[PDB]
Paper text:
Vinculin and metavinculin have seven four-helix bundle domains that are connected via a about 40 residue (in vinculin) or about 100 residue (in metavinculin) flexible proline-rich linker to their respective and distinct five-helix bundle tail domains, which is called Vt in vinculin, for vinculin tail, or MVt in metavinculin, for metavinculin tail. Metavinculin has 68 amino acids inserted into the vinculin polypeptide chain between vinculin residues 915 and 916. Vinculin and metavinculin are held in their closed auto-inhibited conformers by an extensive nanomolar affinity interface between their N-terminal four-helix bundle Vh1 subdomains and their respective Vt or MVt tail domains.
To further our understanding of metavinculin activation and function, we determined the 4.17 Å cryogenic electron microscopy structure of metavinculin in its native state. The initial processing of a single ab initio three-dimensional reconstruction, including all particles accounting for best two-dimensional classes, and subsequent homogeneous refinement yielded a 4.17 Å resolution structure that overall resembled our earlier crystal structures confirming overall the auto-inhibited conformation of metavinculin. The peripheral α-helices are in the 5 to 6 Å resolution range, while a few of the surface regions exhibit resolution of less than 8 Å. In our cryogenic electron microscopy structure, we did not observe a definitive density for the C-terminus (residues 1120 to 1134). This suggests that this region is flexible and in various conformations. To better resolve and visualize the molecular motions of metavinculin in detail, three-dimensional variability analyses were carried out with the default option of three modes on the entire stack of 1,303,504 particles that was subjected to homogeneous refinement.
Numbering used by the authors: 1 to 837, 960 to 1116
Write the structure that this text describes.
């Protein structure tokens, strides 16, 4: 396959394929029009010269570079290119004899593919080696990690504190080489953002090591908690290093990410169901304890996370978790109806207090059914990706060995077993296709039964066809999960609109199940948004949530009775589509009300934990205060993480901002135990001088983590939305200042004056971060200036608070406080005041009209990015028939190779054109990250469409590899035009910002 693993490989193949394109448009009169050609016999030797240079180094790389497996695979590679090139000249030599010789036109069309596959192989095959030594570098590091528990003593500390140096500095220089070598934002970003984690936390690993000798100064057998905290980061060192091992091994377009990035969600979920197990079910079992806000909230946290389990599995099980959870919702409100009146809850729910419980416990077992199957479904994809390589191993160099046949037939016994474990009852057409191919693969395995004496002359034709048989397996085993795993929720919210706007009125991806998960996805968050409010404000959102819930199944049926053209089917679709638009501004405005109420006192228990970190047992209650401060820490943090990830998945952010949140909240998910772990050991070995800075380390980790996140959640939501949900929020809190002055409450003003300064400091912090991202000097000055007005008045509120706490029954004095309070909030309001101003492949024809709905968001004709998007998706419509068919006109397919890249290099330009006029860093940076994959994938379509041109109309065309050709055609145009959707949107989204 014509890979694009390296910047160099693109920089050569497009020079390779530029004239093989021009070679085979001569083949258009060569066999389609069937007539004589002009003498392009010199471009023959030119592209020979364009490959012989890498051949003449590739020939000697077999011998000069002393690696073993390069000697194995290269003589398959370039000799095929040599077998191609020798046929090219003789095609022209037979065309020197004859103006148009029927074999000679077929000899040249024979070689025109084998170069392009071969050159893409040759440029890959030793770039495969360039990655390979970096593995053993990392394997050197990963096993020098393994040294660092064999090493636990100080006499090897400063040695290996130095020995990391020529490893770790030698790590990053190879990576920062390779960081320039890839050409995907999806790859370049996830490489280095795992590479900084190992270099940042190796001093933290050293910080564990430097404090372990301090514990080793204390007596043994109570000190391995540090080595377990070492093992904490070392398993993270096991984690983030292993990630970038296999990132560089990917060497193509990304496919197995989503099957892998859903493994994390269930173990996020199933732990969270285990963690929210006890406190949820108690309110279910206590009628007369809480009226529906404390453990009732954790009840719905169980259900809306198990609802996120059911966003993964397939079939009718996509309904049976939805059907179990939604019917559990009303019956809790049937329980909530009882204690709203009171008499029904304790005596009368002798039956009712168990039908709710049985719809949780078997629901726990029902989502447990989706647990181990979906681990094992993504699993053994990699095993059958590995047992083919074990089959690829010996079948390259057989040497006529009949006991190498015996181990290559024993290795296929495991390669047998996987597809029966990969069997599903759904794709019965493909299952008999799969299971029928397996015994056929044992029959070409049974070719080796006749070789009592092994035959490489049999094996050279055996490996000629078992290699095409294994890629007939792997391109079908990955389908055996792809048509069995439903289409995922686009994690940013505007995708879940788009994954469900067009979904409801079309049978196409009704076979796929995009919106059926996505609508189940989208109101599993407004369902969780309504979880955090009290009694009466739980229902007003749930009434909009239950609106879609009863708009759910009554559009699951109208695919039978008519379609979207049917009148009340369209009306129920129109009732559903109108239901979601007023489920926007009561979802994200529901969100931003929460974030200005969770992140207020953003770190106040931690300075209280710092009080708990310093107080000896000479100070009173060094344990139970230290418990409840940590209990205040651990449970406010549960709000802190969960408020962020909701504001992640609802807030309009970059993908890099969303995963930037998603990793940082994951960083919060274990550092919050580490803050507990840091405050622990300082109180285990009491009052160490060397443990305070380690506590101060993880604190100023977590403070830097949270004051990243505090700033980074502010990257997600609107700053119009934060202030308005803060100015009104501080307004009642200055009205809370009015209630505690009417009675004699000094400390409630002392708790309140902080509560201003908990937030009024942060309002200044958001204003400065707005300025440094702003560049209009008239429209960044007041955000600096009024923040400094806020700076002018934050400190006198602390001072007169001490003046009025000493005398609470002093009108005038407490009046002067609230009058000093009166000066605050109008200036706080100023912050948002500045913010006021036929043989057709289907995924071709779908992706054309898919792009058109996105560019029709803007409704004018001025800037030609919509004319760029016009020519974009329209000029794939002609090649809809030309993939899978249209055997003659190969020339239009390459005419489509160029014009699409010509469009997706034009909109490359205009994306970064207005980015040069983009008046915000964060808007330009997010525009820059996506726009570098506009030209990269464009030129790849110059290759791949030209590759299928040789795969077109020969009539010796294998419809496995023509399918492999047309898969890479259509998989491109998805990833092509989905990036173009992000382009023509965010160009307009940056257009108003000027």
């Amino acid at each position: 396959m014509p890979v694009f693993h390296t910047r160099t490989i693109e920089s050569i193949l497009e020079p390779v394929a530029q004239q093989i394109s021009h070679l085979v448009i001569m083949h258009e009169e060569g066999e389609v029009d069937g007539k004589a050609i002009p003498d392009l016999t010199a471009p023959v030797a030119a592209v020979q010269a364009a490959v012989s240079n890498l051949v003449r180094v590739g020939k000697e790389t077999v011998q000069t570079t002393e690696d073993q497996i390069l000697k194995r695979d290269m003589p398959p590679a370039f000799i095929k290119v040599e077998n191609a090139c020798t046929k090219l000249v003789q095609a022209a030599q037979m065309l020197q004899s004859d103006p148009y010789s029927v074999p000679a036109r077929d000899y040249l069309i024979d070689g025109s593919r084998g170069i392009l596959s071969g050159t893409s192989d040759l440029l890959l095959t030793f770039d495969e080696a360039e990655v390979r030594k970096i593995i053993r570098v990392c394997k050197g590091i990963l096993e020098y990690l393994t040294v660092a528990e064999v090493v636990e003593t100080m006499e090897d500390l400063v040695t290996y504190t130095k020995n990391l140096g020529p490893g770790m500095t030698k790590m990053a220089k190879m990576i920062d080489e390779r960081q320039q070598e890839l050409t995907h934002q999806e790859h370049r970003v996830m490489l280095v953002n795992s590479m900084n984690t190992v270099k940042e936390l190796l001093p933290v690993l050293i910080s564990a090591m430097k404090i372990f000798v301090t514990t080793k100064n204390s007596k043994n057998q109570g000190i391995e908690e540090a080595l377990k905290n070492r093992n904490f980061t070392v398993e993270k060192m096991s984690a983030e290093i292993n990630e970038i091992i296999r990132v560089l091994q990917l060497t193509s377009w990304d496919e197995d990410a989503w099957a892998s990035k859903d493994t994390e969600a269930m173990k996020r979920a199933l732990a969270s169901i285990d963690s929210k197990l006890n406190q949820a079910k108690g309110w279910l079992r206590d009628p007369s304890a809480s009226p529906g806000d404390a453990g009732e909230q954790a009840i719905r946290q169980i259900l809306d996370e198990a609802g996120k389990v059911g966003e993964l599995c397939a079939g009718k099980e996509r309904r049976e978790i939805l059907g179990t959870c939604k019917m559990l919702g009303q019956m809790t409100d049937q329980v909530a109806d009882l204690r709203a009146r009171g008499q029904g809850s304790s005596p009368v729910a002798m039956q009712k207090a168990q039908q709710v419980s049985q719809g949780l416990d078997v629901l726990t077992a029902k989502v447990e059914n989706a647990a181990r199957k979906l681990e094992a479904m993504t699993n053994s994809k990699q095993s059958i990706a590995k047992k083919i390589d074990a089959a690829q191993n010996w079948l390259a160099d057989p040497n006529g060995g009949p006991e190498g046949e015996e181990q290559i037939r024993g290795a296929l016994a495991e390669a047998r077993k996987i597809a029966e474990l990969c069997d599903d009852p759904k794709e019965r057409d493909d299952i008999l296709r799969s299971l029928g191919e397996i015994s056929a693969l044992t029959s070409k395995l049974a070719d080796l039964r006749r070789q009592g004496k092994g035959d490489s002359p049999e094996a050279r034709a055996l490996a000629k066809q078992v290699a095409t048989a294994l890629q007939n397996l792997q391109t079908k085993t990955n389908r055996a999960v792809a048509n069995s795993r439903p289409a995922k929720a686009a994690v940013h919210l505007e995708g879940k609109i788009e994954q469900a706007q067009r979904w409801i009125d079309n049978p196409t991806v009704d076979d796929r199940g995009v919106g059926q998960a996505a609508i189940r996805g989208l109101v599993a968050e407004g369902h969780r948004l309504a979880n955090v409010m009290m009694g009466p404000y739980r229902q007003d959102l749930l009434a909009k949530c239950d609106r879609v819930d009863q708009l759910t199944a009554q559009l699951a049926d109208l695919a039978a009775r008519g379609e979207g053209e049917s009148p009340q089917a369209r009306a129920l679709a129109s009732q559903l589509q109108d239901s979601l638009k007023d489920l926007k501004a009561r979802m994200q405005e529901a969100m931003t009300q929460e974030v200005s109420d969770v992140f207020s006192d953003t770190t106040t228990p931690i300075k209280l934990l710092a009080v708990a970190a310093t107080a000896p047992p000479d100070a009173p209650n060094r344990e139970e205060v230290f418990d409840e401060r940590a209990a205040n820490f651990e449970n406010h943090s549960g709000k802190l993480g969960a408020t962020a990830e909701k504001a992640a998945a609802v807030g309009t952010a970059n993908k890099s901002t969303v995963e930037g949140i998603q990793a940082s909240v994951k960083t919060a998910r274990e550092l919050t135990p580490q803050v507990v772990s840091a405050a622990r050991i300082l109180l285990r070995n009491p009052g160490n001088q060397a443990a305070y800075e380690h506590f101060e380390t993880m604190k100023n980790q977590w403070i830097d983590n949270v004051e990243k996140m505090t700033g980074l959640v502010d990257e997600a939501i609107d700053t119009k939305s934060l202030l308005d949900a803060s100015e009104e929020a501080i307004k009642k809190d200055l009205d809370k200042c009015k209630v505690a002055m009417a009675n004699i409450q000094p400390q409630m003003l002392v708790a309140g004056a902080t509560s201003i300064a908990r937030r009024a400091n942060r309002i200044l912090l958001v204003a400065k971060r707005e300025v440094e991202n702003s560049e209009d000097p008239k429209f960044r000055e007041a955000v600096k200036a009024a923040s400094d007005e806020l700076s002018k008045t934050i400190s006198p509120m602390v001072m007169d608070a001490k003046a009025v706490a000493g005398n609470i029954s002093d009108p005038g004095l407490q009046k002067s406080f609230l009058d000093s309070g009166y000066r605050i909030l109008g200036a706080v309001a100023k912050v948002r005041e500045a913010f006021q101003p036929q043989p057709v492949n289907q995924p071709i024809l779908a992706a054309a009209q898919s792009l058109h709905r996105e560019a029709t968001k803007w409704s004018s004709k001025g800037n030609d990015i919509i004319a760029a998007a016009k020519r974009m998706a329209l000029l794939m419509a002609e090649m809809s028939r030309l993939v899978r068919g249209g055997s003659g006109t190969k020339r239009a397919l390459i005419q489509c190779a160029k014009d699409i890249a010509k469009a997706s290099d034009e909109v490359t330009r205009l994306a970064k054109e207005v980015a040069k006029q983009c008046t915000d860093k964060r808007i330009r940076t997010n525009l820059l990250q996506v726009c570098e994959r506009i030209p990269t994938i464009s030129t790849q379509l110059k290759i791949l469409s030209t590759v299928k041109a040789t795969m077109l109309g020969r009539t010796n065309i294998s419809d496995e590899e023509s399918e492999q050709a047309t898969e890479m055609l259509v998989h491109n145009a998805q990833n092509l035009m989905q990036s173009v959707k992000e382009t023509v949107r965010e160009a307009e989204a940056a257009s108003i910002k000027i």
